[PDB]
Design a protein around this ligand. Structure first.
Ligand SMILES: NC(=O)c1ccc[n+]([C@@H]2O[C@H](COP(=O)([O-])OP(=O)(O)OC[C@H]3O[C@@H](n4cnc5c(N)ncnc54)[C@H](O)[C@@H]3O)[C@@H](O)[C@H]2O)c1
Ligand SMILES: Cc1cc(C)nc(SCC(=O)Nc2ncc(Cc3cccc4ccccc34)s2)n1
Ligand SMILES: [Zn+2]
Length: 297
């Protein structure tokens, strides 16, 4: 039987393992659930309605790069409607910032496009924005590719002026991955390397149903522990490679490394930080950084 790095399948067992010498390199996989406490909805059933007024040939047209390029106005009107009114990263995001500053964070793979990871102080090298990001935008012409910052894009969105490139007048598109586009190059380079070197996988606020995350959990070594912090269980499996070839196993007789902590991401992170002796550091970090944002309003 495989080496069992967790002494028990609980948050407590994960924390003891994190403090042990073996655990040096943590990868986080994070989705829309880490940003809902920041006032950014995750598009469960509570988006389709906002679409009707745009008179699309079909609803999925809003996500299609092909359709964007000929009829960009629906997308930019939606982006206005959905633009967050403020950008205060959550307790969960700051938990990741603690991981960075303690030298524990190998990588944050995020499905979010809201930039809160960066606002919380994760740097480009810490991040794989698996679904791209609003943080930058580019002219869509292959020979130009001029880059625009978020301040530029925001103004176009709020002014309701379709963003055109100042060099060539082609459309300028936010660097988010529309259906039709390839995942960022950065995604492919990092993943190979990262996932051999990982000691702990921390999966927060994702149902693990969309790409690329849905593959990623099985790329960790087989002994690497995997903690999910989420409102509901996710990533569970119902071929040749047997133990290599499915998902989370939290509840079977054979479960040996995967743990599900059910509830709000912020609360789960606060609970883990508390076990680790980091609760005051985290609370102090959040207060200071939220204050720093509030002082600029
Ligand atoms: N903040 C954002 O950038 C944002 C917001 C909405 C949607 N999206 C896009 O939609 C897709 C969403 O994919 P995903 O896999 O990241 O999310 P998802 O579709 O799996 O939804 C988030 C998951 O977290 C859970 N959840 C919600 N709030 C929670 C909380 N506070 N604590 C714990 N669990 C909570 C939900 O129940 C769900 O399991 C991505 O393409 C993403 O870019 C991004
Ligand atoms: C507009 C804005 C700006 C910033 C900085 N942050 C946010 S977070 C809030 C939010 O849900 N917004 C969104 N904008 C566009 C959305 C749908 C969509 C459509 C088409 C392609 C997509 C490609 C990839 C992902 C989504 C795509 S959801 N929103
Ligand atoms: Zn251009």
């Amino acid at each position: 039987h495989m080496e069992r790095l967790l002494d028990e399948l609980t948050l407590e067992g994960v924390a003891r393992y994190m403090q042990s010498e073996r655990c040096r390199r943590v990868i986080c996989l994070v989705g829309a659930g880490i940003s809902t406490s920041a006032g950014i909805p995750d598009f469960r059933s509570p988006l389709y309605d906002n679409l009707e007024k745009y008179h699309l040939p079909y609803p999925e047209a809003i996500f299609e790069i092909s359709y964007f390029k000929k009829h960009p106005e629906p997308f930019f009107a939606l982006a206005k409607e959905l633009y967050p009114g403020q950008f205060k990263p959550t307790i969960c995001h700051y938990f990741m910032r603690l991981l960075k500053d303690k030298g524990l964070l190998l990588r944050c793979y995020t499905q979010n496009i809201d930039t809160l990871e960066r606002i919380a102080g994760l740097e480009q090298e810490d991040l794989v924005e698996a679904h791209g990001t609003f943080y930058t935008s580019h002219c869509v012409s292959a020979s130009c590719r001029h880059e625009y910052p978020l301040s530029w894009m925001k103004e176009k969105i709020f002014s309701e002026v379709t963003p055109k490139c100042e060099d060539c007048q082609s459309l300028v598109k936010p660097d988010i991955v529309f259906f039709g586009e390839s995942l960022p190059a950065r995604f492919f380079s990092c993943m190979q390397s990262d996932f051999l070197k990982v000691d702990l996988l921390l999966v927060m606020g994702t149902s693990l149903q969309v790409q690329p995350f849905a593959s990623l959990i099985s790329k960790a070594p087989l002994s690497t522990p995997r903690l999910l912090i989420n409102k509901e269980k996710a990533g569970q499996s119902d071929g040749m490679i047997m133990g290599l070839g499915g998902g989370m196993d939290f509840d079977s007789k054979k479960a040996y490394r995967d743990v599900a902590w059910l509830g709000e991401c912020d609360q789960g992170c606060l609970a883990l930080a508390e076990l680790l002796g980091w609760k005051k550091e985290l609370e102090d970090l959040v207060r200071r950084e939220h204050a720093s944002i509030d002082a600029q309003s």
